[PDB]
């Protein structure tokens, strides 16, 4: 069940994915905000289709009251929705990992989004790529020694070779099952190429910022 998927709309057009971590809070990326005029932003919950087609008894559309930006390092942003999202069968939250935590290598993960698919006639339906956790050291090498990772970054290699997130996928989550429970472990951010075979993807370590996240979201 994908209740935590959020579609960020900037000027009535989908710009980014996001994740409902608490009723009035959405965790997304700084890249998702071309303007400081909150007027142009809307968050859609209950949707499966990008244009919100078959979703109308589910679809929840909320205005954005606040933009709390994460530490200088992180390209994270916390969105306060103008009214709480109603948690029904179609809309739900996603759990966060604890501050002092890590996930084993080769743990299975998923990236979700309405982003670019390289397909001709894309139907606008929510997509999913299957990924597996990778060590930061083995991931730095796999990138041809061009990029070195901080403790704030997380690596995930693709299960189906040519797969991975792209333009329109940013802000979306990297969901893995930590202790039999779905948790947001990473935030999709721009990379160094969309879905390169054998090259893994860098996400941002949500656990690294869980202290800050809980500081904001817990009023």
């Amino acid at each position: 069940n994908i209740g935590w998927m959020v579609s960020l709309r900037y000027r009535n057009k989908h710009i980014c994915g996001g994740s409902l971590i608490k009723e009035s809070w959405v965790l997304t990326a700084r890249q998702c905000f071309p303007s400081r005029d909150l007027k142009d932003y809307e968050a859609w919950l209950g949707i499966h289709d990008v244009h919100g087609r078959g979703d109308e008894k589910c679809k929840q559309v909320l205005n954005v009251s606040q933009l709390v930006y994460g530490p200088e390092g992180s390209d994270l942003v916390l969105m306060k929705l103008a009214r709480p999202a109603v948690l029904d069968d179609f809309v739900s939250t996603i759990d966060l990992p604890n501050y002092g935590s890590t996930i084993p290598e080769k743990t299975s993960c998923s990236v979700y989004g309405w982003g670019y698919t390289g397909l001709i006639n894309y139907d606008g339906l929510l997509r999913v790529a299957h990924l597996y956790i990778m060590g930061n050291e083995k991931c730095s090498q796999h990138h041809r020694g061009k990029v070195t990772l901080n403790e704030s970054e997380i690596c995930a290699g693709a299960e189906k070779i040519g797969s991975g997130p792209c333009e329109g996928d940013y802000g979306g989550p990297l969901v893995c099952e930590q202790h039999k429970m779905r948790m947001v472990l990473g935030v999709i951010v721009p990379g160094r190429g969309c879905a390169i075979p054998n090259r893994p993807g860098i996400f941002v370590r949500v656990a690294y910022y869980a202290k800050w996240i809980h500081k904001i979201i817990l009023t």
Partner: peptide
Amino acid sequence: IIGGCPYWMDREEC
């Protein structure tokens, strides 16, 4: 998502 399956597809059938 380049090379992904639709949301309703299980992990094991990709």
